[PDB]
Amino acid sequence: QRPAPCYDPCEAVLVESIPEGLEFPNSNPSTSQAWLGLLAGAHSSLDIASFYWTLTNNDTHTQEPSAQQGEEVLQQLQALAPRGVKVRIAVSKPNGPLADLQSLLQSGAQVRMVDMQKLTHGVLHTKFWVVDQTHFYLGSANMDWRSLTQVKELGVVMYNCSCLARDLTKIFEAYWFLGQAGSSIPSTWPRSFDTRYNQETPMEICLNGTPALAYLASAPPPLCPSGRTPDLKALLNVVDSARSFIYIAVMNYLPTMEPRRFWPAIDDGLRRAAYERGVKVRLLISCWGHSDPSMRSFLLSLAALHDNHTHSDIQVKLFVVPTDESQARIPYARVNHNKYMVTERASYIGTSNWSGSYFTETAGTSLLVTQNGLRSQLEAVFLRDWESPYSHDLDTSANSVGNACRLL
Amino acid sequence: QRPAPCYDPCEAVLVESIPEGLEFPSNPSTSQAWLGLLAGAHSSLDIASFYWTLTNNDTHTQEPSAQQGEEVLQQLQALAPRGVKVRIAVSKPNGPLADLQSLLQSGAQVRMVDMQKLTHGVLHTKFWVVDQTHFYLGSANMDWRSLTQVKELGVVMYNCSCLARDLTKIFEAYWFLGQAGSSIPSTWPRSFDTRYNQETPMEICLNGTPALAYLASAPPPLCPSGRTPDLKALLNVVDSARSFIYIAVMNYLPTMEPRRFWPAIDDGLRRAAYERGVKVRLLISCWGHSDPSMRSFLLSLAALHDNHTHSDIQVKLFVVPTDESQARIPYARVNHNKYMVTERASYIGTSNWSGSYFTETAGTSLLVTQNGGLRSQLEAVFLRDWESPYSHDLDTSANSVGNACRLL
Ligand SMILES: *[C@@H]1O[C@H](CO)[C@@H](O[C@@H]2O[C@H](CO)[C@@H](O[C@@H]3O[C@H](CO[C@H]4O[C@H](CO[C@H]5O[C@H](CO)[C@@H](O)[C@H](O)[C@@H]5O)[C@@H](O)[C@H](O[C@H]5O[C@H](CO)[C@@H](O)[C@H](O)[C@@H]5O)[C@@H]4O)[C@@H](O)[C@H](O[C@H]4O[C@H](CO)[C@@H](O)[C@H](O)[C@@H]4O)[C@@H]3O)[C@H](O)[C@H]2NC(C)=O)[C@H](O)[C@H]1NC(C)=O
Ligand SMILES: *[C@@H]1O[C@H](CO)[C@@H](O[C@@H]2O[C@H](CO)[C@@H](O)[C@H](O)[C@H]2NC(C)=O)[C@H](O)[C@H]1NC(C)=O
Numbered sequence: 001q002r003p004a005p006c007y008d009p010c011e012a013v014l015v016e017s018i019p020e021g022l023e024f025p026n027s028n029p030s031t032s033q034a035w036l037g038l039l040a041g042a043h044s045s046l047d048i049a050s051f052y053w054t055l056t057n058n059d060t061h062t063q064e065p066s067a068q069q070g071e072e073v074l075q076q077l078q079a080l081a082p083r084g085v086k087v088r089i090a091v092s093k094p095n096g097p098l099a100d101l102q103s104l105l106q107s108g109a110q111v112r113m114v115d116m117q118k119l120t121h122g123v124l125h126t127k128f129w130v131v132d133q134t135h136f137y138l139g140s141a142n143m144d145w146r147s148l149t150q151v152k153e154l155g156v157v158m159y160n161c162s163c164l165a166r167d168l169t170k171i172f173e174a175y176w177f178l179g180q181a182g183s184s185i186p187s188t189w190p191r192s193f194d195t196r197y198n199q200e201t202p203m204e205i206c207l208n209g210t211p212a213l214a215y216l217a218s219a220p221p222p223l224c225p226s227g228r229t230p231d232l233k234a235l236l237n238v239v240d241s242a243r244s245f246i247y248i249a250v251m252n253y254l255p256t257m258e259p260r261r262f263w264p265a266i267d268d269g270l271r272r273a274a275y276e277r278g279v280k281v282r283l284l285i286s287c288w289g290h291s292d293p294s295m296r297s298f299l300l301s302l303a304a305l306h307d308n309h310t311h312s313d314i315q316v317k318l319f320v321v322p323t324d325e326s327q328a329r330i331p332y333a334r335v336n337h338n339k340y341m342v343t344e345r346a347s348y349i350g351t352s353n354w355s356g357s358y359f360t361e362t363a364g365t366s367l368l369v370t371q372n373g374l375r376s377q378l379e380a381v382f383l384r385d386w387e388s389p390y391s392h393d394l395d396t397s398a399n400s401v402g403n404a405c406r407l408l
Numbered sequence: 409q410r411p412a413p414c415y416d417p418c419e420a421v422l423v424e425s426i427p428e429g430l431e432f433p434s435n436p437s438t439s440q441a442w443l444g445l446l447a448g449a450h451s452s453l454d455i456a457s458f459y460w461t462l463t464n465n466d467t468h469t470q471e472p473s474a475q476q477g478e479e480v481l482q483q484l485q486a487l488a489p490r491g492v493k494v495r496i497a498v499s500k501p502n503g504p505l506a507d508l509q510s511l512l513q514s515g516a517q518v519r520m521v522d523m524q525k526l527t528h529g530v531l532h533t534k535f536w537v538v539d540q541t542h543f544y545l546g547s548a549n550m551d552w553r554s555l556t557q558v559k560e561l562g563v564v565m566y567n568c569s570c571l572a573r574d575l576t577k578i579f580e581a582y583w584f585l586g587q588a589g590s591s592i593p594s595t596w597p598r599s600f601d602t603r604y605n606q607e608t609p610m611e612i613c614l615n616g617t618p619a620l621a622y623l624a625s626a627p628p629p630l631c632p633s634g635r636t637p638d639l640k641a642l643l644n645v646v647d648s649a650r651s652f653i654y655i656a657v658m659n660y661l662p663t664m665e666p667r668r669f670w671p672a673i674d675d676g677l678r679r680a681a682y683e684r685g686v687k688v689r690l691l692i693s694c695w696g697h698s699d700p701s702m703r704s705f706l707l708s709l710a711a712l713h714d715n716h717t718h719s720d721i722q723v724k725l726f727v728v729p730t731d732e733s734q735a736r737i738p739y740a741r742v743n744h745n746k747y748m749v750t751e752r753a754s755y756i757g758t759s760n761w762s763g764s765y766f767t768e769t770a771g772t773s774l775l776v777t778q779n780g781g782l783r784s785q786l787e788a789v790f791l792r793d794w795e796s797p798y799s800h801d802l803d804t805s806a807n808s809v810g811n812a813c814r815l816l
């Protein structure tokens with residue numbers, strides 16, 4: 001027996017940050033405008049799951065005009081509680097004090113810091129916003145001014161979708177519980193955290209005026225209540241159900257536990273899809289000066305499967321954001337942070353890079369949607385990026401790419 | 409509680425077939441060992457076999473190099489009239505076999521196992537059990553080519569009655585299924601079961617020093633309760649290795665040769681190399697009949713050799729040269745060897761390394777651990793072959809190899 005259907009008029013918008021200087025002779029609203037609109041409409045509540053906070057020039061020891069959007073975001077955040085909006089912030093436990101969070105505290109917001117390292121030996125990596133139990137953002141953008149103007153980002157805003165937003169709030173509530181000082185993960189979570197919407201029975205929603213199936217997946221497994229699909233299971237179900245193509249854009253990909261362990265769950269899913277079903281796989285991996293060089297061997301290993309006897313067809317490119325003389329002075333910028341997957345039948349938008357810890361120890365969430373739309377728009381972003389001059393084959397020269405790339 | 413130790417004076421001898429013309433800078437030949445066993449037989453002979461082409465008449469040839477195979481058939485014909493009870497199990501042929509007609513007329517018993525109806529595989533196993541005392545197990549078929557025109561690797565275990573009687577239970581499974589209408593019991597009668605397996609191996613005296621030995625079996629429906637499956641035994645050798653893994657097999661393929669991807673061994677090797685720094689060397693045979701789909705999978709493995717991960721996987725192809733006269737012999741001039749050696753353990757098998765051999769087709773393997781010996785001799789066979797001019801890297805030119813090779 002399926003759970004109750006939803007009648008809210010849900011509308012989904014893909015939201016991107018395109019770094020200054022990147023041009024794509026060819027648009028989605030930017031992450032900055034979507035966040036400021038959400039904040040301007042907020043009247044009752046805001047829940048933010050976050051990794052770190054650097055919204056200001058002072059935070060990064062810089063004097064960049066590019067930080068203005070981030071600075072504006074922070075100002076609108078400080079204004080929320082004094083106008084009646086209950087703000088709750090969950091952040092991964094930091095090394096030093098955070099100024100953004102101290103300002104938010106003095107404006108009346110609540111903050112708890114989640115020590116995922118003690119609980120599970122991971123971090124709180126999830127990025128999402130839940131606003132007025134009605135709208136949500138979920139995607140790759142951190143609370144970082146660079147994430148608006150100097151690095152590439154992909155996420156989704158779901159508007160007017162209370163059924164799904166309350167479902168996200170259950171995940172946030174797990175974080176909020178573990179943010180108290182003496183908290184320990186329960187053996188069995190209270191029934192209030194549980195959901196009836198999952199891979200087996202997704203939520204039936206109206207999405208842009210058309211029926212669709214949607215659910216939210218969660219990581220790590222100790223944070224998953226009884227009926228919540230694990231993130232790895234949802235991702236692999238998409239990989240395994242594909243019959244025509246699998247397009248993947250992710251910042252890092254590694255079939256390992258980044259004592260070292262080999263971790264082939266995703267890698268074997270792609271090998272299987274291509275050999276048994278002839279599905280076309282395209283893998284778009286980001287590269288900058290901080291890329292883990294051990295990525296190259298595994299990527300070459302996949303690309304060897306492209307072969308006219310098995311008729312398997314797997315292809316890999318690297319996406320590199322060019323940096324000019326002034327931009328190279330910005331710390332930790334000029335990269336592509338996207339983490340998403342689209343097939344001929346399904347969409348997957350996530351907060352986690354594709355290696356084992358994000359699926360066994362670290363916090364993450366993903367949104368899964370099936371419809372007969374958002375899918376075609378996600379495929380359009382992927383093809384634009386894959387065909388741009390910013391994407392390069394594994395044999396490309398490292399000086400011909402516009403930025404440092406260890407994988408070349 | 410371990411089973412009873414054995415006090416038989418077991419002695420193991422590596423036995424090889426070296427094709428005419430192949431030269432190396434030496435173990436007894438398959439032919440000599442088989443002739444000694446046949447002349448000494450006094451009470452019983454069991455042969456598990458794939459096919460029978462011991463004579464020139466069988467292959468429609470006039471080769472003098474067939475004489476050894478013909479002598480073998482002659483000496484087999486002398487067994488029954490001397491009182492030796494001969495039982496031959498053969499994979500169900502697609503036509504009459506003259507060898508088997510002549511053996512029936514001399515008094516031997518012959519049964520044909522239709523594994524295709526039983527499990528959708530074949531009866532691929534090659535072994536001899538002699539007087540419940542000695543056995544041959546290896547790659548050589550009942551084929552005169554297997555003595556002089558193809559490269560073979562096997563073992564003869566002499567004076568080891570406990571282990572030979574253990575092999576006879578496997579043969580008895582074939583003999584039962586060689587009757588018409590036999591159906592493979594859901595649980596085998598207790599007489600087929602064994603106490604010697606991966607968990608508690610037979611304790612033997614091997615060349616005067618203690619050793620641990622057991623015999624593994626395929627496919628799973630022919631395995632009674634205490635019999636280790638072939639795949640489990642092979643994978644345990646791969647996972648226990650700490651220094652190196654040397655494998656020489658005629659075919660290797662991570663699939664079910666409706667198409668299925670089959671990564672059990674492949675992921676074993678990837679894990680060994682990444683997690684434990686194990687040096688894996690893979691020596692694959694190549695001739696004009698090689699499945700071309702092998703090359704892409706082998707390239708995928710060789711891509712893991714990297715100075716960042718420190719994984720060290722290497723692949724060579726072994727090609728037996730042929731001169732103009734030899735190319736007239738049908739289905740010859742290849743290396744049929746199937747074995748694995750580590751710094752700790754020996755594995756000698758009858759199966760090629762692809763999925764059907766472990767799920768549907770009959771096979772047997774011998775696993776030995778000892779604290780030098782058989783292990784060091786197998787490693788010496790491998791290193792000789794690996795450093796010989798008959799071994800070539802994946803980028804070698806097809807014209808420089810001495811024979812047709814599909815993977816180059
Ligand atoms: C695995 O183990 C077996 C042992 O079981 C071993 O085979 C033996 O190998 C040795 C060589 O190293 C052979 O030794 C030769 O034997 C010649 C005489 O053979 C006759 O006498 C044998 C001894 O009989 C005594 O012991 C038995 C058992 O205890 C007992 O019943 C008797 O009453 C008696 O006390 C006898 O075993 C043997 O019987 C076999 O053969 C007959 C005929 O084929 C057959 O009917 C039987 O059923 C049985 O199979 C036979 O009766 C001897 O002349 C010869 O001496 C010459 O050679 C040596 C060296 O070459 C010179 O030094 C010497 O100067 C002479 O020129 C030699 O001693 C022995 O016969 C083998 N036994 C068998 C059964 O074959 C294998 O080597 C082991 N395998 C491995 C790989 O190591
Ligand atoms: C679902 O409806 C929303 C709301 O109208 C659409 O969002 C618009 O998308 C276009 C480009 O795709 C933007 O230029 C507009 O600014 C967006 N509007 C808002 C309010 O953000 C969305 O495109 C629709 N989804 C589909 C699949 O058509």
Ligand SMILES: *[C@@H]1O[C@H](CO)[C@@H](O[C@@H]2O[C@H](CO)[C@@H](O)[C@H](O)[C@H]2NC(C)=O)[C@H](O)[C@H]1NC(C)=O
Nearest residue numbers: 419420421422434435436614615780781782785
């Ligand atoms: C174990 O004992 C057997 C019995 O002698 C050894 O077999 C001999 O091995 C040498 C070298 O390979 C050959 O020249 C002989 O022909 C073999 N004898 C027989 C009867 O075939 C075997 O080598 C020993 N194993 C070890 C590790 O020492």
Ligand SMILES: *[C@@H]1O[C@H](CO)[C@@H](O)[C@H](O)[C@H]1NC(C)=O
Nearest residue numbers: 009011012013135158159160
């Ligand atoms: C959501 O609902 C509001 C008011 O109910 C409506 O005005 C708006 O256009 C809808 N869509 C979005 C994206 O907010």
